[PDB]
Amino acid sequence: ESPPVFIKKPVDQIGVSGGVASFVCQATGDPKPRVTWNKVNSQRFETIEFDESAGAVLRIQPLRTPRDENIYECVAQNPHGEVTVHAKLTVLREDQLPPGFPNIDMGPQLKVVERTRTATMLCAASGNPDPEITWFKDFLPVDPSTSNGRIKQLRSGGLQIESSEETDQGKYECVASNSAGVRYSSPANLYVRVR
Amino acid sequence: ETGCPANCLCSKTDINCKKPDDGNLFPLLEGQDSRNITSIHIENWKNLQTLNAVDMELYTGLQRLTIRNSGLRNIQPRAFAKNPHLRYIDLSGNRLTTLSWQLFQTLRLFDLRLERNPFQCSCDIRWIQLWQEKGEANLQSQQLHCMNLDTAVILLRNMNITQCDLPEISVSHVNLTVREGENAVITCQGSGSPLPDVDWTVADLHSINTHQTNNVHAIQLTLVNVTSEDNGFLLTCIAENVVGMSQASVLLTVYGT
Ligand SMILES: *[C@@H]1O[C@H](CO)[C@@H](O)[C@H](O)[C@H]1NC(C)=O
Ligand SMILES: *[C@@H]1O[C@H](CO)[C@@H](O)[C@H](O)[C@H]1NC(C)=O
Ligand SMILES: *[C@@H]1O[C@H](CO)[C@@H](O)[C@H](O)[C@H]1NC(C)=O
């Protein structure tokens, strides 16, 4: 028996009007905890659950300003306690973007790989400071450590998937972040074919 | 060697997988022949529980989808966003406990088959009752059932959810004229139970525009430094809940140099 602890705290997001923002929370505990997001029901606000409902992403798309600017709350619960963490959304207009706001120079493309073959999804971005690239698959952050060793994030920013398996199939997007804000590429699907 | 997926039959326009299959992945055709596929028929797939967008997106020419007497429990949001010609959908004989009209918002459906699914009676399927009554997509012909939380099973036509109807909508102005270079403000508001979401679907507007919130959900649209290129633009507002959708519009007129 043990109460809920967040092993993923959501982080503040500064997005662009028309774009995407995501907040991730995930909680551990015994019994396994259940998490939920909070603040009306909208297609533009989507909750994607994971880890048997002990994790959840709140994904907002397309972003609207100023109406979407808010503090969003993720609450985690089990029979030994209830706990909450917060995160802030700012949304800039296209005409308000500072000079070094992350830019996607070339995004991922549609790809088909044969099962067991290696596959690399490409992403290249620029901005100031130099932007940090992370990857999302089926609206979920990709975690290399659970792949495991099988999947690497390259220095160039590509996602390298060795020994392709059926669960590697899905919709990928790369996300470029820096102190100015966050920018999503267009999505690209990776298909895994037989043999 | 064929590209055709195991235990299906393929022609240049059709894919049929009707023999009992234990697999849980949706059948993917291998090749760029995908956009010319107009008909996909799946039946007796007891382990096919979910349908993802990624499975549907290659079949851009699809017109007819049958997933029948299989294990289908749910369909991801926007699964059919890239199948705009899809006008016939059969989901009968599956394990669907609920279904959202939003899956179908971009389609013009002639036939949607929902018989022999274990629906739970809730406000999330009020729309189905409504489509039945207004004769939409041949739902009027079908005998669907749903279950109450006390386990009583009823005909859908006897379902009686209170405080659960179509959203209403209004706008502050019938038309709007503005001088080039100036601002303008207008409001759209939705009402009803449950409370609708409200959006100005106005992305193709060239002028800078901001959306601010104000038992009624109201969004103010601010136009700033308006340009002549938006003259004659129809400013559209939409009001959505789980039951359905209402639309309202304001004609924009821009004069000056
Ligand atoms: C699919 O159909 C289109 C037009 O009908 C044509 O351009 C294309 O070559 C066809 N593809 C195949 C594989 O036959
Ligand atoms: C349905 O029952 C509710 C009370 O639970 C009531 O609001 C409504 O008048 C009833 N309508 C019908 C047709 O039974
Ligand atoms: C407004 O738009 C005009 C025309 O594009 C542009 O040249 C100008 O910089 C803007 N002026 C103001 C006051 O916003």
Residue numbers in the entry:
A (entry chain C): 29 to 67, 72 to 227
B (entry chain A): 29 to 62, 78 to 257, 262 to 304
Question: Which passages does the manuscript contain on this structure?
Answer:
At the axonal surface, type IIa receptor protein tyrosine phosphatases (RPTPs) (type IIa RPTPs, for example, RPTPσ, RPTPδ and leukocyte common antigen-related (LAR) in vertebrates, dLAR in Drosophila), are a recently identified nexus for extracellular interactions, receiving signals and transmitting them intracellularly to the cytoskeleton to regulate neuronal extension and guidance, as well as synaptic organization. There are two major neuronal RPTPσ isoforms, sharing a common intracellular catalytic region and an extracellular region predicted to contain three immunoglobulin (Ig)-like domains followed by either five or nine fibronectin (FN) type III domains, in the central and peripheral nervous systems, respectively. Previous mutagenesis and structural studies have demonstrated that the proteoglycan-binding site lies on Ig1 of RPTPσ, and comprises an extended positively charged surface of basic residues101314. Binding of postsynaptic TrkC, is reported to require the N-terminal three Ig domains of RPTPσ17; the NGL-3-binding site has been mapped to the FN1-2 domains.
To facilitate crystallization, a chicken TrkC construct (TrkC LRRIg1cryst) was generated, which removed putative sites of N-linked glycosylation and residues 63–77, a predicted disordered loop. A 2.5Å crystal structure of a chicken RPTPσ Ig1–2:TrkC LRRIg1cryst complex was determined, revealing a 1:1 stoichiometry, in agreement with results from multi-angle light scattering (MALS) analysis. The structure is consistent with a trans RPTPσ:TrkC complex spanning the synaptic cleft. The V-shaped RPTPσ Ig1–2 module contacts an extended TrkC surface consisting of the LRR convex face and Ig1 domain, with a buried surface area of 1,093 Å2 per molecule. Three major contact sites constitute the protein–protein interface in the complex crystal structure: site 1, RPTPσ Ig1:TrkC Ig1; site 2, RPTPσ Ig1:TrkC LRRIg1 inter-domain region and site 3, RPTPσ Ig2:TrkC LRR. Electrostatic interactions involving RPTPσ residues R96 and R99 and TrkC residues D240 and D242 dominate interactions at site 1. At site 2, Q75 in RPTPσ, interacts with TrkC residues E287 and Q148, while the side chains of RPTPσ E78 and TrkC R121 form a salt bridge. Site 3 centres on a K203–E100 salt bridge between RPTPσ and TrkC residues, respectively. RPTPσ:TrkC crystal structures provide an explanation for the specificity of this interaction and also highlight an overlap of TrkC and proteoglycan-binding sites on RPTPσ.
